Each structure stands twice: as structure tokens, then as C-alpha cells.
Design a protein around this ligand. Sequence first.
Ligand SMILES: [Zn+2]
Ligand SMILES: [Zn+2]
Lengths: 105, 105
Amino acid sequence: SELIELKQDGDLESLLEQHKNKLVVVDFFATWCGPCKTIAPLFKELSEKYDAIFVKVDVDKLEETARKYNISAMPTFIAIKNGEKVGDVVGASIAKVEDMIKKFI
Amino acid sequence: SELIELKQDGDLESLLEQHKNKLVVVDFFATWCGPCKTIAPLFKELSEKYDAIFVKVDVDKLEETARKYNISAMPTFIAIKNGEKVGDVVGASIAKVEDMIKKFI
Ligand SMILES: [Zn+2]
Ligand SMILES: [Zn+2]
């Protein structure tokens, strides 16, 4: 499994260049968000089930990245394939997140 | 490296059940169709470049399948991922077919 928690704007772009052959799935979350805390260990369980790169982004730490992907509602999950955003799930729905991964992996 | 040409209605459904964990890309074509003949060898080239299941369906041999996928323009290419239709390309555009394959493979 690979599960990477980012620190500052620019970190996702580096990650994407360094993981070119693989689907990247990003959980945009906030420290004030309860459903984000509930879904966190389940997103970690998915990272152990699928051969993709799982990434966590705190929207208060990566504010320009949150803007780049038009992120509003917490959590939002996006799938990034060959460097482009291809799908999203808005809200804490682990079934939806898994369905999105199956569609793009 | 699988390129499979079907024979009768029901064949696509058995194919999908037997190839459940790979992208399937179906070329719905007709014998009367000029663009279909132009793109055929280029579809075969893609089949030799990508690890997916490539399928050819003559709409006059698999009439109820063509209906079931609402095929109108010839050719039409359909991407199927975990058994659900996830994308299509209407018309003989080999660049857009390859883009579809990359997004879902
Ligand atoms: Zn096979
Ligand atoms: Zn894949």
C-alpha cells in the first residue's frame, strides 16, 4: 500500500510526476470535519486493497491545491489518471469512493 | 492481446462475465460502413498496445445487442468496466478511442 499525507502546495504536483504509471486517489479533508475522521481508517483500508496511490490533503494546509480542484464540501475524493482529474465523490461515502476506484484503476 | 469477434446475441454478456477484472472495449460496426473498414486495422493495432479486451460486434448479426446499447452511428465504440458502460466514442476517431482506453484501463 502507499498512503501519503501532504504538507504544502506543490506537493501533489511532485507526487503526480513521481507516480506516472498509477491511479492517484486524493482525500481532501478538514480537521473540523467529523465525517472525515469516521472515513479516514476506511480510506486507509482501501489503500491496502487496491494497487493505487492514496493521498490525504488538509484543505487548510494546501489552500491553493484545494482551489485548483474546486474543492468545497468536506470530504471530497478525486481520482487523477495520467495527471488529469477524471472523477470525484462528494461526501463521506466509502462505497462511492470504492466504485470510483474500480471505474478508473 | 485479445481481439474477439462475436457471433450472436448473448455472446457479449458471456464475454463480460468471463473477463470481469479487465477493461473491455467494443467496436460496434457494419459490413456496409466505409469508416468502419478504415479504422479496423487501427483498432487491431491498439489491441496489440494495451492490456484490455477488444471486441468486434457486427450490428446486423447481433441486432438485439446493438439495440440494447442504443447504437446509431457506425462505428460506435463502448468502454465497459466492471460490467457497466463507462464511456463511448461515436464515429471513427482512433485518437478518441485511445483516449478512452487510457482513461479507463
Ligand atoms: Zn479471454
Ligand atoms: Zn487499470
